[PDB]
Amino acid sequence: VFGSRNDRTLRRMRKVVNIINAMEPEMEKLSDEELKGKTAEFRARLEKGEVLENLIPEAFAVVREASKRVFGMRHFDVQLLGGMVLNERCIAEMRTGEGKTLTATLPAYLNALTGKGVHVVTVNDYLAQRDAENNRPLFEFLGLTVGINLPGMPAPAKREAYAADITYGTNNEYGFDYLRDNMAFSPEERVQRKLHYALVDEVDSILIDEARTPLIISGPAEDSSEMYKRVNKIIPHLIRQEKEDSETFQGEGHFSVDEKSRQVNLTERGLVLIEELLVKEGIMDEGESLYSPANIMLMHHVTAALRAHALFTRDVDYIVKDGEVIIVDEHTGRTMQGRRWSDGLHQAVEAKEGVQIQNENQTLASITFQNYFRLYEKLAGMTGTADTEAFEFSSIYKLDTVVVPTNRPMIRKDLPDLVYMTEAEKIQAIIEDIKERTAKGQPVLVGTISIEKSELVSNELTKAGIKHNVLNAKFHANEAAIVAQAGYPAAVTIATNMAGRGTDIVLGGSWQAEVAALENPTAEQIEKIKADWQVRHDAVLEAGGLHIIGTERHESRRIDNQLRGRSGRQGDAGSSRFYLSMEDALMRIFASDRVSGMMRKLGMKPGEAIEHPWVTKAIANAQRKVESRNFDIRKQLLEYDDVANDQRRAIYSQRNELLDVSDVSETINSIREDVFKATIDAYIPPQSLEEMWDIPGLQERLKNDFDLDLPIAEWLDKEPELHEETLRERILAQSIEVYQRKEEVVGAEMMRHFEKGVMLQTLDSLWKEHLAAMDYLRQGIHLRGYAQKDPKQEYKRESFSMFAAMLESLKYEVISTLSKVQVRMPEE
């Protein structure tokens, strides 16, 4: 892209808009089938040597033309600007009323021409299926295909929707689909296509709030994981006092009077008790430490058995009857038979006693939305008039913030904040502001964020004698009835914490809702009501438009601005008036209410409008400061997230390669020699002495993990010229020979499929571990981050070592399993 962002971008887009407007009269001379022909033409031109960004003038013109024949609505110039910006990797701010559907249709058609697939992200399935079928007669009219992806849709149908030019779906399913696709065994099992372009309807929520939302799939294999019972089996060999089993201890702990430390904690700062668990039996007995990133998984498993012994006492902390585990509450004497402590805690208990061990419930597959949308090349979306955290768009997703002009001039009179001392003053001032407008015939919308104030203002309004209708969310039918005339002259509507966007309240009321209340609305009736409605609309205009009143403001300006943007629909008339008291909790956001107390000496004067604009500016400053503090926190959290993100991306790339390719002999053989070398180097050091070689250890390992019986002691005994290198190669050669011999019995193509599957399976198996391991270290690093060292940097270091170790273990078991397989080999 070229041209100064924002400033120059605005006029740059205008240059194209002019061309589109000039070519419009020409498009009106083109037949319906010609518009369709242009769409196909662009497809050909794109492969010929045409730039997508250069097709905008013609493409947008076709869309504008087609829309006039399909919907009869011409895409406004302001919409052309926004739709054009949505072709890049930027976020466009759209005012309430401009027309999101009439804007998002432009970038969709343009990017759809590439045939890569336009991924439209919706907040819910309602809008997803709504716009999908609504815009269908438009896109399909030009030849493009519209596909809808609903959560839970079968793979066959998904493939049809994903193979379409434009795909409508929810962010939730979008992420899950990606997970299922990447966790496939065969490339034909895929459901996705390409992450070329993504257009999200509301970034305010999906990109901001849902940024740190991880799609955790808890899909266990069930069965019976009796493997855990073999771990806890080593505990009864110890005594709770010394040698591993000890409730905290730390030398003393407490007196001999039921010293069961049920506060968990756990420590073992002696480093002499843990020495009893390590070594012997098998696994974690080779010489590995339990306080290493390459053994964090077992660390969180062995401690589970410990915190299931003296931590959870039988019959008091929990009760198991007939295999049914029920938690016993000692606080109020309650029994929880439908609950179980996660983090593998319940599993340790079920593995301690004669209970059937389950398959737990942890992260089988997970991905964060932020780490998902960041994979898309062209990531664009629409945002509301909220701003605030909008600055984080460039830091979280690296998107540029662009504002789109309104269709009509916004005549929303924004008034300053009138801060009073007591709530009585604040409320009374509101009543007065409303009462004065009740005589002028101006509709008043009270945005109470607190239910306590909603009833308070309602009682006060009744006291003064002012008509009012409260939007009780418990009665949607009531709300719809009020909203229909919420813009009616002198109509006081009270809203208790309204969600974003909201219904498009038309000034004067809604004749549609009026004619819909009649049995048979004839042409005469409709025209009559429209005539009356017209007068009602003009009346509100002379009154001052829709008057918004805010009793209390919100910390995050995102919601604050959302309420302010309720008026002036598509550039209409309105007035915003906010109030505040020294009793409201909002005065605590200024670091300390003691500071805000300086405003108590402003005079106030209940009944006199002090009108001080600097007050609003002060509040707005603090409002953005609150989120600035949150931003620092979000950044700190994302710091750890990106670490797992890169590792995930890396391992997913390798898994994808092995997924797409059919043959994997190259990889298998290349890692085969490496695995053997590493295993040999562990018993036989390079360029050492004969008496420095552990022949028995290597032989046993070969006859254990590689299923290869080789008498190395006999080989070197008769062949002294074997030296070392030749000896290593001999073992490898013999392995390859027997390997091929096993292969011939199973089948060449079959073995290749087997190896491919085993690689993916082993990778996935370790991936499940790594997912939990990352978490174990994520929280455990808090006790590892000492002074004179950054806890994030050290974490990344340990995480890198963990990943490396995982890779080594991957190649190890992959080659081992491929050899461990007991194939029925006949006498050759």
């Binding site: 899909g219 266990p220 294999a221 069965d223 994981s225 493997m227 855990y228 073999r230 771990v231 012997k280 039996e281 098998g282 696994i283 974690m284 007995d285 998984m297 077992l298 498993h301 062995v302 398959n359 737990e360 942890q362 089988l364 028995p696 046993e700 254990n704 087997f754 599957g757 085993v758 399976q761 996935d764 198996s765 370790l766 499940k768 571990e769 939990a772 397989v821 007991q822």
Partner: peptide, 28 residues
């Protein structure tokens, strides 16, 4: 004779718990 006894029968059951969540199986 020299009876070299060793605990080669190590118990990887503790590790199998991690892969237990997605324990797929083929022919063997």
């Amino acid at each position: 004779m020299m009876i070299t006894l060793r605990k080669r029968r190590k118990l990887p059951l503790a590790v199998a718990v991690a892969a237990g969540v997605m324990s797929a199986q083929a022919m063997a």
